[PDB]
Write a protein that binds this ligand. Structure first.
Ligand SMILES: C[C@H]1CCC[C@H](C[C@H]2Cc3cc(O)cc(O)c3C(=O)O2)O1
Ligand SMILES: C[C@H]1CCC[C@H](C[C@H]2Cc3cc(O)cc(O)c3C(=O)O2)O1
Lengths: 485, 486
């Protein structure tokens, strides 16, 4: 019962049985059935009923072991479990002696089993092996039920987590049918999945640097998928999307990972109205798809504290950033914008409310600060859009038709943090401040080639999974989060 | 022929002159009744010269051709198909603007919204008759012709041109997407579980390929881009996901050629309680069913040589030939290599073989890479008419694969080849920690200590397969934005 000594004992076990000719790691075991299939077929039987003349070969890992004439194990696989009832009478003795063969089995051992299904004495569904073979041996003591969490090796060694905690398994299953539902959701609308370079010549933001040796160029990992997708829009693909890894060099956080999965799509002849309805539809239908209801409960502060219900029933509240800033601070900010006096105006708003006064105090920064202290968590109760950002804050999104100095842009916040960001792209090459005379330039040139009016959108899939799987950290919804050794 | 530069200038001037008149050359929203392929489908079979004059639609498109009175013709393309735009003076709504100038404004490459009614030309091909046509997004360049692209840098560098003009290219990439979709669904239907793995590992590259190196500054940690998805996936098999797979980008740093590029999409899966016979049936089934899915037949024509040159026909009808590598080498060279293997005598023997026969190039002389080289010359190009397996590689050549049951010094391993190129790689994983050579990465060797079931695993170059199914001699053709020096 000292895990190092246990490890040593089991290693020695392995070799002295290899010495007897028995191989503890056999090459192949033909599998007739899987534990869930097993359950589904045989779940309805009488209590104490055996069916002894259909012989099955089933496999799994032994997660519970209990002990002359009988042995009970708990065999698990595919996140589900059946009991293993070994009877002396049914055992095929010529394969090996009963005692010796079933004494070799320890918890965590992966075994093949030849036997017949039936339910137990009072009829818990079980398989009765005529013989039990060791497919792979576990050399370590598996941590017990609550042995992990806090742990945090759980991120380092994930397999242990997936074995012991069901919640993580369930979490990841959920993650991939979130992505599944997203991909299908898009595909059904005629969207087109593509792959875009992860190493680009030009990369404004905080990148990684990598180097190709023989091409002898230093390249940067992508901060987003946007530009080449828009170039694809220019190319005749008018509905296009990509689900892929994106990279940023900034610091790690609860909600931040250097490596995060994003879904960015571009949609021709659509503006942020169709994008908003797209968001409402997607999130509503997704939440209903998972939970059979639009209402979910999410624990923001710990598990130990009162959750908050989040209602994904559409439509979601839309808040003009500037307007409600102007209403709450009760000053008329602008007329637009960065503009000297208004700067000063904004700055004083920042000081009296004892907010950060971020430096350098340019206008965009001040607007971001103001907008987030005031607006960003205004509504927790459900996802809400922050709309019509100033176009000093958004030198991509096209100018708002009616409201000048603003953009057509929407940013969807769930539970105080950013999830979705979508805007109508600016297709006028003369109105893009970014294109300079003497890559990104390929996008500007493609822009000279007449990109149609198009709305774009991008997603937080890691964070979305966080909220839908009810987790407070991004590392819980990621299989192997990046960590320092 | 006109000069491109001042054409560009001319319509830039056009654009802001149009802005000076209050007109917006880049409108915010055009709302669309119908998309061109839907248009096509609905109205194809209208009688010649038939006209639905009560039905008014708003349709968008890009102008790819223009004819010069009171009558105008265009080719409106979108979503891969084409309708003609018949602008009749008598039909055109004059209240919005003058016919002449409104339609003298439109020139090739422009993206226009069109409000008008469907019909068919008296000559009998489908047409949209605008009562009104508005400019959505203007194109400032002449655009090239079917001459313009292939063969060219800008076919790759400016991709949108390739997709617009060539009309072959986007069929290619559609195909790539249908390949990958078909693969994902193919795996999903078998109870496989898609996952996402780190693209950045502390693990370096591998003996075969140099690593891409990057650095995370705040953790002050040197990270290496993944050369394969294998290790975390196998760790997931330890974790209780018995059928797992990932389709994603994979990074190798070696040189660039037609069949190789540094950043390529691969698909790798791991299958518990499966041995490679399951894997070969899997390979044969995937490829057979796939080729039939796309082409309606099991045989496809690929040009091993250039387009001018005679294409060979490849037959994907299973089962495919299995060729034991060492034994085949022995049979063709008519020398008995081994018994095993890296024997100084045997290494010498192999060298003598390569130089004496082929004058094929010796290399830094590892026994493994020797075997690989002789294999490369002799066996690989044997079958170009059918996809074929090179099977049972010696374990010196394959550290990860499990030992062959009945044959010493060999592994249970397959490698599938199309036209002499390496498409698919699979083997039965070696789950014994003590048998394992590396354990004498650490996280994987430790994963084995909690036990890993008998598993088998496979990986797919997607880009190459896409080449062979889309008939391309270079991988740069099936990758949307290939990497090139500017
Ligand atoms: C592509 C964008 C669109 C807006 C929401 C979301 C923002 C994104 C920012 C971001 C930055 C970072 O360094 C690490 C991360 O995990 C994230 C994230 O998940 O959310 O995804
Ligand atoms: C995952 C693997 C399995 C075997 C086929 C294929 C091999 C791979 C080799 C390879 C190496 C390299 O440095 C650059 C490349 O573009 C490729 C490739 O396309 O195919 O994919």
């Amino acid at each position: 019962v000292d895990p190092r000594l246990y490890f040593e004992n089991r290693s020695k076990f392995i070799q002295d049985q290899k010495d007897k000719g028995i191989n503890p790691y056999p090459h192949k075991f033909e599998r007739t059935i899987s534990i869930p299939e097993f359950i589904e077929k045989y779940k309805d039987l009488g209590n104490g009923e055996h069916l002894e003349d259909t012989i099955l070969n089933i496999t799994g890992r032994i997660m519970r072991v209990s002990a002359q004439k009988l042995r009970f194990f708990d065999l698990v696989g595919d996140g589900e479990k059946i009991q293993v009832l070994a009877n002396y009478s049914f055992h095929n003795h010529e394969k090996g002696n009963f005692a010796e063969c079933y004494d070799k089995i320890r918890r965590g051992d992966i075994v093949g089993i030849v036997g017949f299904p039936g339910k137990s004495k009072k009829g818990e569904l079980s398989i009765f092996p005529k013989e039990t073979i060791l497919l792979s041996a576990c050399l370590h003591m598996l941590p017990m039920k609550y042995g992990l969490k806090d742990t945090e090796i759980r991120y380092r060694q994930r397999y242990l987590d997936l074995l012991i905690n069901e919640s993580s398994r369930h979490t990841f299953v959920t993650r991939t049918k979130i992505i599944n539902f997203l991909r299908n959701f898009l595909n059904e609308r005629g969207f087109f999945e593509v792959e875009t370079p992860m190493m680009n010549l030009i990369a404004n933001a905080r990148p990684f640097i990598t180097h190709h040796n023989d091409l002898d160029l230093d390249l940067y990992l992508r901060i987003a998928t946007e530009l080449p997708l828009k170039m694809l829009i220019v190319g005749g693909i008018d509905k296009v999307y990509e689900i892929g890894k994106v990279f940023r060099n900034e610091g790690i956080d609860n909600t931040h990972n250097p490596e995060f999965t994003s879904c960015e799509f571009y949609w021709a002849y659509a503006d942020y109205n169709d994008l908003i309805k797209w968001s409402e539809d997607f999130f509503s239908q997704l939440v209903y798809h998972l939970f059979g209801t639009y209402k979910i409960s999410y624990n923001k502060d710990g598990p130990e504290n009162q959750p908050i219900e989040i209602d994904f029933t559409p439509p979601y509240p839309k808040v003009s950033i500037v307007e409600e800033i102007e209403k709450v601070t009760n000053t008329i900010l602008e007329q637009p914008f960065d503009s000297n006096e208004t700067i000063e105006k904004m700055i004083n708003i920042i000081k009296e409310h004892k907010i950060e006064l971020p430096n350098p105090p340019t206008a965009a920064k001040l607007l971001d600060q103001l907008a987030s202290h005031f607006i960003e968590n205004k509504y927790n109760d459900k996802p809400f859009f922050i709309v019509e950002h100033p176009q000093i804050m958004s030198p991509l999104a096209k100018y708002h038709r009616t409201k000048p100095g603003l953009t057509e842009r929407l940013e969807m916040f769930i539970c105080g943090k950013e999830v979705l960001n979508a805007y109508t792209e600016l297709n006028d090459p003369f109105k893009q401040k970014e294109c300079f005379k003497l890559l990104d330039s390929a996008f500007c040139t493609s822009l000279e080639y007449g990109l149609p009016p198009t709305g774009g959108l991008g997603l937080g899939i890691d964070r979305i999974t966080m909220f839908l799987t009810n987790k407070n950290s991004i590392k819980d919804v990621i299989l192997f989060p990046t960590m320092r050794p």
